[PDB]
Amino acid sequence: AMGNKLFNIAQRILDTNSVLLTERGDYIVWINNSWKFNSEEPLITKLILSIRHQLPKEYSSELLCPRKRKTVEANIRDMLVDSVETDTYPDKLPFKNGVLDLVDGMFYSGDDAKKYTCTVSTGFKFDDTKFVEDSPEMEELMNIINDIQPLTDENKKNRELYEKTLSSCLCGATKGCLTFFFGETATGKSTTKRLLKSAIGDLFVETGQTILTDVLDKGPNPFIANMHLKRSVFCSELPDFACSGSKKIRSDNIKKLTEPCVIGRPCFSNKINNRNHATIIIDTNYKPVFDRIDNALMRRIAVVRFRTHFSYDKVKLLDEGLDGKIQNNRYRFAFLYLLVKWYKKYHVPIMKLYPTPEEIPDFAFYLKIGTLLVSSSVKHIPLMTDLSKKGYILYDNVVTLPLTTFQQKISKYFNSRLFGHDIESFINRHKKFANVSDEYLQYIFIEDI
Amino acid sequence: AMGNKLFNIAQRILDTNSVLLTERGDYIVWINNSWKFNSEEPLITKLILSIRHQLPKEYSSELLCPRKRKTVEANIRDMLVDSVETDTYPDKLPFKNGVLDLVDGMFYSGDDAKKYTCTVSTGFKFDDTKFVEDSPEMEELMNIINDIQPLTDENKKNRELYEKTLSSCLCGATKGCLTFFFGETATGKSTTKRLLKSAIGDLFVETGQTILTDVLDKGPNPFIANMHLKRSVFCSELPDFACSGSKKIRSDNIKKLTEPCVIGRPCFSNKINNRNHATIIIDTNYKPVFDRIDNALMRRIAVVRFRTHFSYDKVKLLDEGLDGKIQNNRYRFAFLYLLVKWYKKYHVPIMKLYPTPEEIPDFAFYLKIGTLLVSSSVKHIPLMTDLSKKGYILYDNVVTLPLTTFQQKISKYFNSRLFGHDIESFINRHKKFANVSDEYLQYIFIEDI
Amino acid sequence: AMGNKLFNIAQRILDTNSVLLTERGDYIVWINNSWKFNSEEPLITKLILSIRHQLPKEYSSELLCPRKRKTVEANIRDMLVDSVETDTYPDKLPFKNGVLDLVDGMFYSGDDAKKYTCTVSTGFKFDDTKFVEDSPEMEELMNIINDIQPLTDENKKNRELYEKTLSSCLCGATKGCLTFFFGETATGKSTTKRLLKSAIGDLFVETGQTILTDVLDKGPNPFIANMHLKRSVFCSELPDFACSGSKKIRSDNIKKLTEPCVIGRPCFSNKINNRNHATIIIDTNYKPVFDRIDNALMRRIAVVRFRTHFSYDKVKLLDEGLDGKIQNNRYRFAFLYLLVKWYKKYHVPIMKLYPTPEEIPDFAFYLKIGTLLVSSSVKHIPLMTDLSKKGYILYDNVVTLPLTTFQQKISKYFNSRLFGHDIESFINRHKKFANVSDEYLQYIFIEDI
Amino acid sequence: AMGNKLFNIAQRILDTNSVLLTERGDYIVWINNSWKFNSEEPLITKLILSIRHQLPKEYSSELLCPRKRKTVEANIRDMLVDSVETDTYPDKLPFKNGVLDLVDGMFYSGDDAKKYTCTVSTGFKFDDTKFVEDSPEMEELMNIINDIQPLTDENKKNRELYEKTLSSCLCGATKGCLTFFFGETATGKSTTKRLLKSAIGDLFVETGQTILTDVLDKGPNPFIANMHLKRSVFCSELPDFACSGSKKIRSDNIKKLTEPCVIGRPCFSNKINNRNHATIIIDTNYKPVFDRIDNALMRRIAVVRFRTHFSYDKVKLLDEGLDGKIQNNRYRFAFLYLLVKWYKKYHVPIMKLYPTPEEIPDFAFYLKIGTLLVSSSVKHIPLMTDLSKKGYILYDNVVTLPLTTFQQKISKYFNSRLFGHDIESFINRHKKFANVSDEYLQYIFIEDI
């Protein structure tokens, strides 16, 4: 003994596509020009109460009743079967008033933004009037950024990489190459972090050294749970790697947070499948030291140096009143305009994240090795005719070089006194013993091919 | 004071067999040509709302009411008594549009797929138009795979085993022999993993070294919980086994993940009985080192080597743009067609997984021992007439060989300098002491029978 | 089959804005001139029962029914969509009778206080009659405070900083500089803590050494959960830092509790985003010793010394009966008046928290270093023409000073015998090796520019 | 479609103030002359069913219905807004028949006790007939107590302190000074504990060494949760402090359980704010040894010695049948009368708890130090004219005494052989080094002022 019109109301509600079912089995609603979502309290009832006005008068009176409204909510829940995924596009930026595009830079609102289904938003209302380049705040922030990173040819590559990383912080896609902020304390890294956080609102997230030094997938992991559906990750607090007791940046962790779907359990929920749209920028004051080094990690890591102090490459005075404007979001829209311009300059139309392993001594050593230490293969076997008199003894049909000769030759190209531990670790990892003592390495110099 | 027609509606719904009760006490529904299932929210109400159209007009109006719909759902729950198990067949591949067969290669959809009850699906809609061999993507992917594994007689066995393992990744049956991917970094293992994951969608799963180096059944285990009802398991991140601190591949774990029903507790649920349909491929860069070695493990382990680098057996240049096509699923259906062809070539009509222990030095040593070190028995007792003058002293009615003689003879067939630790461990594990010092081993050479 | 007038009642209730939805997804109500809030039991029903009197007679009779009242509560929950944040203003002090302003010192009540949405309150009813300067309690408490901190020129800076910190305890904004209470046992720190707690009621909170010596974000953290939305944090029980086993004040923790939004998980709830409005005063009896020292921490730390004992700078007799008046809140409103006067004197109109690192020997050493040890840069490279004969050898295009020369010169300005460990730690942290032994530091004296 | 009279019934119920809302958000009821309270099951329905008799006949018939009774309960819950706190008075003792006053010694019952809102009760019905001094049980118990503590001038102070502590066990206020029971095994401490427990019923609580030797605020803490709203805490089982492995009585814990509101988390509930009305008596057999010693702790600790054994100051025979009478509560009301008389003698009208640190050798040493070792100050600087020739060298404008002179002088007043460890710890804690070796202490003898 119930009503029949309520199913028609539910069908009309589903016609507008104002409520969608996520791939995680959660229901989202489109209210106040924003895809609001809440797993704890279902927002379907609020959606119905909101959109009662967009329906004929014969239905709003029916929807005024909470019993009938819950009935319509149940009907909508039954009708939503296809678990349509959301947040597909990486080139759209959601706001509290709509969605701002990164391709053309135009801001959408209302039903134009409704075409996009964003799980989150920037956390503040968009303002085109404040989103203009012709403003004193824009010039002030441009000068501040140029102080942080000079527009000099010596810093040209570093400045360009810094701009590319800050622009990629906008993109809602998987990060292809981790980025590091190298320098000293208060060299511009913290100011950049604060400006980016103020610009992107709730999309920003900050964390410590846990994800870089500890195991991620072990029971609950609130850090990874919060990092999901984010736009940028800032990892500060890195320890003195030379000093004892400081954990290394685990390459397993780096390979873990470089995938579209990163595992990790949230708190009292099943959300292990996490979408990773965040540009992870690591704030540190020392040169990074890792546990495992290989070509994949060297292609996964970019380094942005900071060489300008504010009491290096340039020394200026401290601006104590700068932080107050950042906390008041004075340079929020100016920084957003700068980020949009950088995205248009670099990442439009294709996202690009190229590594800079040459900025790390360990990765530079490994690259200079891999260039001159190509691994032996079947194609290298016919080189024995010339390598027999060059010290290469053929062991197990592999061109093998004696350890003593390998060390005497690697001391010629690398500073053995500076690279002592690195050479020792490379030898201990990549050497093979003939019987007990005739230790050899299966790598051939270019000068011997 | 309720209705009587609702029970008739429930009986009609159960006539179509659109809702089934699993062996785990969970209810599945058949909506949108897919066996959708959800333990959190019962999908029976959605099933009724969907199939109201497949019923006379006198019943759809009744079903429009959520109260009566919940009543029908309760009736269906009461009527479902026989806990019919699902996912029986290993030769069927489920899709978002139906089920693709591996016997004939024909794709079923609609009620044809409804005959099959698949707990999961590949996670994407099937497309026969893209599932064709006559396509440029197929040729490109064939060339890429041939680069990863050449079609050479020297690599013929390795390539054939690699194809067999990738085809067995499709089969929804228990794995009979674990498979290893041996090589260096970025030798083709990661590309194969990405291609297989893109091809099989949600059926793919990836994990670390925990299941291979740690204890599985200890409280909650989300890894095993996710691995259930899967088609393939990829285990990357294996440590340098020669270096200290790196755990060994526990043979107990290997024997644990080689059964149709593998124990392991999920998170806040009772699903310890897990169906294992996954082909576990282990990505590593070193030769594996285990904790326990025996004939069962040697028959449980297959090794697929990778001998082609992309800057070995062949060295080529790097294709940086290859990963973008994989992430865009350009070679998804081409890889699926290749997998289907391999399954037809090898696993049709009978699944076969034969071990290759000869690719591991430890297993090769153990096999060469077991051939020449047959254990003494009652049948070997009458050999004493000839073995008394051959050094075999009869102890406890067992043909016993002195430890010194055993070592002096095992040094003849095995390189003692290379196999020092292996011989020492075998002696310490399989020797017996006569009184305190006349240590003997209960094994006889073939040259002495 | 329900009523239509109930939605009109809900609309009238929402017209008064007596119920708001927080950013945390929680509902607050305005009853008895106070923004009462409870996550466990929804107070909306109580709000409706209270404000039935502020509605026409045709609606109070409807609201007398708990069924209709729950219906109206559901309607209000549906109508509350915009998650309006609360506790914006830092210059307003909430009471059980209203809100007391810090700008003009006038107390608001009723609808005047309703304009302000305070999550918490001082926990006691305001009394303007007791909030007067012309009272014997005010003079007694002024004399007591002057005994605790004399109004002498030698103590002028310390007394002024103490007053500024106690006034900032009122402000509901983020703390910009941590404050320390240094002295001996019962030198006035405990009396100040008790007086401040009695003055500010529930806004006060006290904790131990856990947040200063341990990791905050690790699972549940009831300390941080209680510290949220607070006005002041008192950290007593600091250990003897010279003695072994005593943990150092972690600079990571200090940087953690200096942000408007501090992470940390509560008990069985999702409230990791915590608003930090608390002035953290650390009660200690020793000079602090930290794990990491830098300019940011030196700008984050202020020190208030206590130099007057009550049996230093002054010694008096003990007042045993003082604590009884504090526990009876005799000097509650007098201390509140003093705090308001201090806030008007210092923090009106702008909150200011300036560090005093010169009160810590470690920070004084670091400041005297950083003044005379400016780091080398590109601008310092052209100084080589004069620094070549001054001992500065150019290494890697950096002005480098030998370690022996650096030590022989740092012994001239700092007492090496007193600063032995500090100099050793600074050398071990900031030195670089040329090859193996020619250790250098990249810092230049002012006398050499 | 409900009734209107039910709200009138709820208003009449709230008129009697038979149900109150606690500060913890819990509801209490007044049934059977007792403020019964239960967080698990709301007792409001039972209260309504009980007080239906105190209402006109037109309302009891309405209240007979459980549906209408639950409706009235909901109305009462809505009407209870002001979270009135309970258990204010420290001078009232609750019983199962009412409340017994400590000021005049008169027992209240019915509505007279209803004026008082006690969270707990003594757990047994009061009996004025058994609450008389003229009874053989009173004389027997007086003789037993005099055996436990003689009425001798040598024991006069100890007996008086023991009586004061036992009387303060009645007071429902915060303890101002911790009390210790010192002696040997079965010297009267256990008998006193049993008698007090039998006298005060459920108000008594007993615990081990955890709260005195471990950290309180670490997750759940059922000990502190049970100790809340109690009248006395007995801590037995103290270990041999001289032996290794025995934890010290943490002064941090002592300062923690000496506040009206003591933190500590209960089990699966939010009751961290705990009211501490309990007199904590510590049962031990050794002299206490602490981790931190200062004037605050010396003023926080009282010691009651036991010097009469029952096979010291007196030795008698064992009364084996004494415990049976205690377990049968024969001396319950006699002990209650004795406690009331002691409260009238000492704590009426003002609660007093004065420390006795002279009973502990460590505290006696510290007091004798602090008398003769007044810390140097600015007022002590002008004493340099006479202290320059007395060995006091002026360092950093502080009167400093050499360590060798300090030791040679402290050996004159204290037995250095007995106080070796104490003097060593005091030196290691309170000394300062001039440069590396000229160690000094900033304390001046009285003989030098």
Author numbering:
A (entry chain B), B (entry chain A), C (entry chain C), D (entry chain D): 321 to 631, 645 to 782
Copied sentences from the primary study:
The sample used for the cryo-EM data collection contained a roughly equimolar complex of D5323–785 hexamer with a dsDNA 30-mer obtained by mixing.
Cryo-EM of D5323–785 yielded a variety of projections that generated an electron density map with a nominal resolution of 4.1 Å based on the half-set Fourier shell correlation when six-fold symmetry was inferred. The electron density showed an organization in three domains, which could be fitted with the Alphafold2 models of the corresponding domains. The electron density of the C-terminal domain was also weaker, requiring a lower contour level. In our structure, any additional electron density, which could be interpreted as nucleotide, was missing so that no information about the nucleotide-binding site could be obtained.
